């Protein structure tokens, strides 16, 4: 349904961002750095036998306390590499046993809970906090605070996500040389922002990323969650310019252009949640060393368990 | 798809409410009455010629400033009857010209904007304000603050709505003894709440009501917006009892049981958004003088323009 | 899903029409004009308080008696501007209270009931009368389609022309300020009247239907355009005749003849009336014109926002 | 989705008809018999080799001229049994070769075209003739529904009775072995003819439509029964008048009067013609009768399996 | 939804086949020729009166016994032309009375049952006989797809070549007028036979399936092509193996080799067999050829209109 | 959409099985046990660090070689309890890392690959081995359904009984602490194993499929149950035969014979495995049992909540 692959590979749409993109993010991170990180780990009673699981609490956007899980495989290694895992839309940190892949592969896994979501396919425990009034919005998170980048939901998520990397680095068994940032769909869009904004992340795993190239996304598909923005615009007919202005500060394409760490991307050519031209726009602008795995017959599931093996091999080759 | 009509007409399921239902509502309304109502009626340059439209502002839940419209038909009579109109889900106050029916029929019309919504089919101008943290929720309004009645979204909307009647009553040209409360679907549910909670309403028009008999609604249909609650529960599998205890304080069946003012209901027997059994549970418990117009072949549109004429005739008879 | 906006704005494709288009319509109107208009306005008992409602009857196609409403706002004015309102597919005149917008804005509103429809979303009271009723697919789009002389829209468009003469006959109507308006089917009817009427002074044309039929069926499989496609799936031998008939009714061909000022609207995600069909008509429209473009709306177009634009537009025009 | 089979078999709900049901039909048929039948059989140049095909024209309702095909298998016998075939909703007579089953089984087949339809899945050549064509929902189900004298099926069912007279006029037809047959709309028409024709000798009634309307619209939201629901959703003041009209055309009411031997079929998962509507009709049917029950089939019913059952049923019936 | 027609007419994509395409088919066919054909025609008791029906069995792929019907019109001519009919996806030979068209037009019809299918819209009676039956997606499209030697259509296409020899062996068949025919799956089978058989005289290829697989799975998400997509969505490591296997069975590669006169049909709105897949095959077809193009039709194609075109085409070819 | 919870808890429909049910299974398992099990475990080079992964091969139905995974957590305890895991419809054994749950909780996990499937959502490596593969609807539900001796699940259920013996042969498995587990198709397979094998200590049976087939096809039209309905729609003469065969594989009949303690789960909104089908099995389940009821869940059931419940249930059992 989207551009053919030869064209996708060359797709570099003209970017749109405001003159103060970097200032906005510098100011955002400085204001939240005023609150102590205060990373707290507490060992959890669980039935897990090959992993030690910890409850995590750390200060994200403006000192607000975000939950997570830390999963440490029980191995002979002194320091271990770490994957910081960001979660898809409507998900949250779930149970420790929802995240066994990375620890089973010998990586500590830091799972960041997603403020105010956690109700659509995996439970969450962390609330959101608005900057004052909660404006008229379409159901969901995509238009929550959208009339101002200062009030916009993902300002708070992305800042949480940057602070999560610091929280993971605070656990002493984490090898700070081998902290990886990872996610699919919303988790991939979050990881992309972090790849530009964190100075602690060493590598990026970005699958079927959401939050990329919003302007094109709403022209290409009518699926959720991108349709929340379309549906908001269908009603608020006078707000096009302001909505896209706000979104430009959170667009993965604009972060990709600033990001310098090694990355492995994946895309499903039949994905109609995250259309391939949106994924390719981000990939093509990504300024670090990069590869992409392309799945021509997959929808939003992308490479699934095959991609998971690709990630393990990529990281092994990168860190050796 | 629902019970046959002969059974709908007798359907009076055991009600479920907590022992402190009334006290919850007394304390809520009392806390909000500590702020001055401070109703403002500012003439809005519209292009209307047979109606004068005022931009309304008034203090609803916890003094929060709620928007509305006040439309006055161009008639001499020093005191006119008044319809206070509440709005369907994802709607908001829109433009003054969106509400010309009741003014054209000789009634002043007070249209209350809906906090936080106004983004699905008609625009709105009024924000919500949470009680502190914005808990994990499913997209929309149905599960916003659902883990505690003190935090639940409809606490705030219902309080706004009671206060809206007071605001309408403040307008010098409104006949304080001919104040009707009205709405369809979400608007119907809010009106039904108001019909129990306000001391100032003279009659109820309650069309295809939503927010009624939640526990059964979600068994019968999988449509939105009731599906937001199902979908929350599909994830938060441990929260059934808490969710339904919270919803009990906002259930139109429990309000119907307390309401004493005359009412005209309507129902579409093929309505799969507000199932017939949910509307009939509310209607059958409704404690005031009452009549119901039944539309056997209609879905959620109910009686449409036909029902509007039934309303005009009902009020004329009542007020003679 | 259709051409990008930069291409829609330049989209002026080769028009298809027969050499006798104007003669067809001159002969149609002249034949119907032999019957007296006989416009009848019967004041009616109503619950309305700010508006006076009249039941209307007038002679449309071949003297057939078409219903309407006339809604007159109660204002201290010896003459008032007037909007002649045409109705969307499967609708009809409904109740007087269904049409309160234009009277509330200070316009007399003449609502024309639509022959034979009135059964999908708003009730109607006017029958159709055929020229035999040929084999057709369910609906109105293919009724009489094998010959322009028998086609359903010959009758509707005649009715609609006659409606404006009927409105002009009400004494309080300001004949310098008669507006023709409609959305979707209403807008396709309005485009035809904008070419054919001797009485209309402005056009409001929203998300128009009955435009560029040959391209519409290639772009969408929605109804009501799909009635045409489904007819042709069965009558495999009738492609050329069907498009020949439709060319006499195509809003793109009317637009090219129309001279009055116009305000259009279009939803770029409208899959009932695709944007390239709407832009074909708008771009060929020969009078002074403007268009409001709603990039995120489907067939609802600009909704209540566009209603505000209309009132502003007519106020400027007529001041 | 409907009643379980044990209950369907006992389902014999209270019938609804007006006091003048028989009078309505007697006068309808009397009036149409005033016009000469004038059945015209024109040998049609054909590529067919085992069958002789004829173009048929005959006088149906009020003398209106209806098309058909006559297909005669090339056999030695002087007189042949005959199946009068009625056609499903949105179909028409199509081509001669569309109807080869019955001829191949040694039966002359008279295929009646369906007035005004012919545009959904197979083409047709016969027009309808109404005077005013009232507001209606798209299609045939609500055409003229506010009065049984104007209703579309009054004309179809008359045409269908006249068809049997026309088939019987063909010299090679054995008038002792005239079968009336159809599926869905075809079946509902055949059910009416089983009560109204004095010439039909046996009925093949598959997955019948036009039965138990009031219950059909409560059970399913499919077309074409949904045309009726959608008309009532708009004309909310007309529920009584619509069902009164429909009572004169209801297969259940015809079934109670029909005397000829019949073979029915039903699909238990058919959501076009719900099984309760079909069993209501079957259970009231007053002639010698059998029903083939296909529990896993939708509207296709027994398909080719049923065709074999019909052949066997008629062989045994006719000795 | 596909290429516009002017581009379809010129669509001649680079073909993909392995170096050993012809050798694979020569060895396949030589191996199956080592088993005796042993055509068996058992005359059946039938209700049919204009046609003689035979129960057919013959040896297809590797001596496996395949069912069929032979329908002989009762005609004075002692040698008759013959159409060997292949059946659409999920069908099978059904009953003899399912196949009356060609015998009514004076052709012997040999209907080939389809191994292992017969369970979706018409029953069948013939099993498949594979070795191990590899992991597969539900259906026939992926059965044995990891190796052309194990692939399901190797066996169907061999059956189909053998069916033409079985038809030829019936004494009343005129071996100079054997036609091979099908639609959709039947048309892809017929197209393979048009390249592989030395006995067929003409090809009727309607809306052909089993063409240009690589592109089909990009254009549509419908079944049955979506079985291939779904297999690849799971077996993410097997893209190259899958399309290599499929290249031995692609109608486009057979069309390039076929020499006999052909009449194709295509529906421009067919989203089961997309127009670009059909035209790729049609444009490579190396024999004398024509195509009937149905711009408004989906997968039904020309339906009964095309059946007429077929009968005319063969009459002209053979006279 | 199904019975209310109060009725589901009381739903014990009359069972249907043939008089030779036990004999059929006795002979089936005896014939397969004549071939050596020959379990082979090969340590796999793996990226996994907390788990030792082994490629498994073993003899299932009639010596046929079935793949699997053996996942051993790296722990001190020399003899570990073991969960034998059966896979959902269209799945297969996938990668070792797809099955980390049970090993992470301290259990050796034996994952049985599913013959012939492995192509819908997780890839598989094991073929099926039928002679003739009868006419069937796409998928596995109707493969060999005309005889219980040839039916697909005869083979799978035998494989699954043999998997328990193959897990028991691994030296680090505590052969006295083996559990059988599955969701949907995996739950139906585990249920059969709960009746057929004497080795298992406990059953984990989530949203079970393969239960109460006769009722399943009346209640939902979803796949995979709809493959059966679809087969019956065409093979209209095979209802009795199809249900007789299925009675030998019906989870409700195996439940009646199972004695080991069980934890079931059910989604009350599951329209793949309807609640009445799951309750019919659960209600007839003869051993100590409990059911987790998820009223707001569809076929996902309890998901990770249910997994926690399983870990607790086994912990109590093996203390
Ligand atoms: O894609 C994600 O970010 C998670 C999840 C998912 O994977 N698909 C989808 C679609 C709509 C809403 C939420 C979801
Ligand atoms: O029903 C309402 O309260 C308003 C509106 C409506 O009329 N139906 C519907 C369905 C889903 C969301 C919103 C709506
Ligand atoms: O578009 C119209 O003319 C009215 C109405 C409408 O607004 N959409 C639609 C689609 C199908 C039939 C009728 C309609
Ligand atoms: O059922 C019929 O009478 C004919 C045909 C048919 O077989 N099904 C169906 C459904 C809607 C419209 C028309 C049809
Ligand atoms: O197209 C065919 O070969 C037959 C039949 C058909 O006509 N369409 C279709 C689609 C899916 C499966 C089977 C079919
Ligand atoms: O339910 C299963 O056994 C697995 C999988 C599933 O979870 N749902 C579903 C539906 C159709 C085919 C296969 C499946």
Coordinates of C-alpha atoms in Angstrom, one line a residue, chain F residues 5-191:
Chain F
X5 CA -22.4 -18.0 33.9
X6 CA -25.0 -19.5 36.3
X7 CA -26.2 -21.8 33.4
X8 CA -22.6 -22.5 32.1
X9 CA -21.8 -23.8 35.6
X10 CA -24.7 -26.2 35.3
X11 CA -24.2 -27.2 31.6
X12 CA -23.8 -30.9 31.4
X13 CA -25.1 -31.8 28.0
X14 CA -25.7 -35.5 27.2
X15 CA -22.5 -36.9 25.8
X16 CA -22.1 -38.7 22.5
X17 CA -19.5 -41.3 21.9
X18 CA -19.4 -44.6 20.1
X19 CA -19.4 -48.0 22.0
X20 CA -15.8 -48.7 20.9
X21 CA -14.2 -45.4 22.1
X22 CA -11.9 -47.1 24.5
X23 CA -11.0 -49.9 22.2
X24 CA -10.2 -47.4 19.4
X25 CA -7.7 -45.6 21.6
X26 CA -6.3 -48.8 23.2
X27 CA -5.5 -50.3 19.7
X28 CA -4.2 -46.9 18.4
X29 CA -1.7 -46.6 21.3
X30 CA -0.8 -50.3 21.2
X31 CA 0.0 -50.2 17.5
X32 CA 2.2 -47.0 18.0
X33 CA 4.1 -48.5 21.0
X34 CA 5.3 -51.4 18.7
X35 CA 7.8 -48.9 17.2
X36 CA 10.7 -47.8 19.5
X37 CA 10.3 -44.4 21.0
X38 CA 14.0 -43.6 20.2
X39 CA 14.0 -40.3 21.9
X40 CA 17.0 -38.2 20.7
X41 CA 18.3 -35.1 22.5
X42 CA 21.0 -33.0 20.9
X43 CA 22.4 -30.0 22.8
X44 CA 21.9 -26.9 20.6
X45 CA 24.5 -24.1 20.2
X46 CA 22.4 -21.3 21.5
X47 CA 22.5 -17.6 22.5
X48 CA 20.6 -18.5 25.7
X49 CA 22.6 -18.2 28.9
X50 CA 20.2 -19.2 31.7
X51 CA 18.8 -22.3 29.9
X52 CA 20.3 -25.4 28.1
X53 CA 18.3 -26.0 24.9
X54 CA 18.1 -29.4 23.2
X55 CA 16.7 -30.3 19.8
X56 CA 14.4 -33.3 20.3
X57 CA 13.3 -36.0 18.0
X58 CA 11.0 -38.9 19.0
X59 CA 8.7 -41.5 17.6
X60 CA 5.0 -40.4 17.8
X61 CA 2.2 -42.0 15.7
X62 CA 3.4 -45.2 14.0
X63 CA 7.2 -44.5 14.3
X64 CA 6.8 -41.1 12.7
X65 CA 9.5 -38.7 13.8
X66 CA 8.3 -35.6 15.7
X67 CA 10.5 -32.6 16.6
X68 CA 10.4 -30.7 19.8
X69 CA 12.5 -28.6 22.2
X70 CA 13.8 -29.5 25.6
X71 CA 14.6 -26.4 27.7
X72 CA 16.5 -27.1 31.0
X73 CA 17.0 -24.3 33.4
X74 CA 20.7 -24.0 34.7
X75 CA 20.0 -24.9 38.3
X76 CA 21.4 -27.0 41.1
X77 CA 18.6 -29.5 41.7
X78 CA 19.6 -32.7 39.7
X79 CA 16.1 -33.9 39.0
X80 CA 13.6 -31.2 37.9
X81 CA 9.9 -31.2 37.4
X82 CA 8.8 -31.0 33.7
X83 CA 6.0 -29.2 31.8
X84 CA 5.1 -30.9 28.5
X85 CA 3.8 -28.1 26.3
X86 CA 1.4 -28.5 23.4
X87 CA 0.9 -25.8 20.8
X88 CA -2.0 -23.7 19.4
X89 CA -3.6 -24.1 16.0
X90 CA -1.3 -23.2 13.1
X91 CA 1.7 -22.9 15.4
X92 CA 4.8 -25.0 15.7
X93 CA 7.9 -25.3 18.0
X94 CA 9.4 -22.1 16.8
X95 CA 12.7 -21.0 18.4
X96 CA 13.9 -22.2 21.8
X97 CA 13.6 -18.6 23.1
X98 CA 9.8 -18.7 22.4
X99 CA 9.3 -21.0 25.5
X100 CA 11.2 -19.3 28.3
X101 CA 8.4 -19.1 30.9
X102 CA 8.5 -22.6 32.5
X103 CA 12.3 -22.9 32.6
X104 CA 12.5 -19.4 34.1
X105 CA 10.2 -20.7 36.9
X106 CA 12.4 -23.8 37.5
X107 CA 10.8 -26.4 35.3
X108 CA 12.2 -28.3 32.4
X109 CA 10.0 -27.6 29.4
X110 CA 9.4 -30.2 26.6
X111 CA 7.7 -28.4 23.6
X112 CA 6.1 -30.8 21.1
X113 CA 6.1 -29.6 17.6
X114 CA 2.7 -30.1 15.7
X115 CA 2.8 -32.3 12.7
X116 CA 2.0 -30.4 9.5
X117 CA 1.1 -27.1 11.0
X118 CA 3.8 -24.5 11.9
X119 CA 2.8 -21.9 9.3
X120 CA 0.3 -19.4 10.8
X121 CA 1.9 -17.5 13.7
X122 CA 5.0 -19.5 14.8
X123 CA 7.0 -21.7 12.5
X124 CA 7.2 -25.5 12.8
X125 CA 9.5 -28.2 11.5
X126 CA 7.6 -31.5 11.6
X127 CA 5.6 -33.0 8.6
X128 CA 2.3 -34.9 8.8
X129 CA 2.4 -38.5 7.2
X130 CA -1.1 -39.7 6.0
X131 CA -1.9 -43.0 1.8
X132 CA -4.9 -41.0 0.3
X133 CA -5.6 -37.5 1.5
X134 CA -9.4 -37.2 1.0
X135 CA -11.3 -34.2 -0.2
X136 CA -11.1 -31.6 2.6
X137 CA -11.7 -28.0 3.5
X138 CA -8.4 -26.0 4.0
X139 CA -6.8 -26.6 7.3
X140 CA -6.5 -29.5 9.7
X141 CA -9.9 -29.9 11.1
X142 CA -11.4 -31.9 8.3
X143 CA -8.2 -33.8 7.2
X144 CA -9.2 -37.4 7.0
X145 CA -12.5 -36.7 8.8
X146 CA -14.5 -39.4 7.0
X147 CA -12.9 -42.1 9.2
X148 CA -11.5 -42.0 12.7
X149 CA -8.7 -44.2 11.6
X150 CA -7.5 -41.6 9.1
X151 CA -8.4 -38.5 11.1
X152 CA -5.6 -35.9 11.6
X153 CA -5.9 -35.7 15.4
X154 CA -5.6 -39.5 15.9
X155 CA -2.0 -38.8 14.9
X156 CA -1.5 -35.7 16.9
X157 CA -3.0 -37.1 20.1
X158 CA -0.7 -40.2 19.7
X159 CA 2.3 -38.0 19.2
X160 CA 1.3 -36.1 22.4
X161 CA 1.0 -39.2 24.5
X162 CA 4.4 -40.3 23.2
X163 CA 5.8 -36.9 24.1
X164 CA 5.2 -37.6 27.8
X165 CA 7.4 -40.8 27.5
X166 CA 10.0 -38.9 25.5
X167 CA 10.2 -36.1 28.3
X168 CA 10.4 -38.9 30.9
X169 CA 13.5 -40.3 29.2
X170 CA 15.6 -37.2 29.7
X171 CA 17.9 -37.8 32.6
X172 CA 17.4 -34.6 34.4
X173 CA 13.6 -35.0 34.2
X174 CA 11.9 -36.2 37.3
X175 CA 9.7 -38.8 35.6
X176 CA 7.4 -38.7 38.6
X177 CA 6.7 -34.9 38.3
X178 CA 5.6 -34.3 34.7
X179 CA 2.7 -31.9 33.9
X180 CA 0.8 -31.5 30.6
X181 CA -0.2 -28.0 29.4
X182 CA -1.7 -26.2 26.5
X183 CA -3.9 -23.4 25.4
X184 CA -6.7 -23.7 22.7
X185 CA -5.6 -26.5 20.3
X186 CA -2.8 -27.1 22.9
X187 CA -5.6 -27.4 25.7
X188 CA -7.6 -30.0 23.6
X189 CA -4.4 -32.0 23.0
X190 CA -3.5 -31.9 26.7
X191 CA -7.1 -32.9 27.6

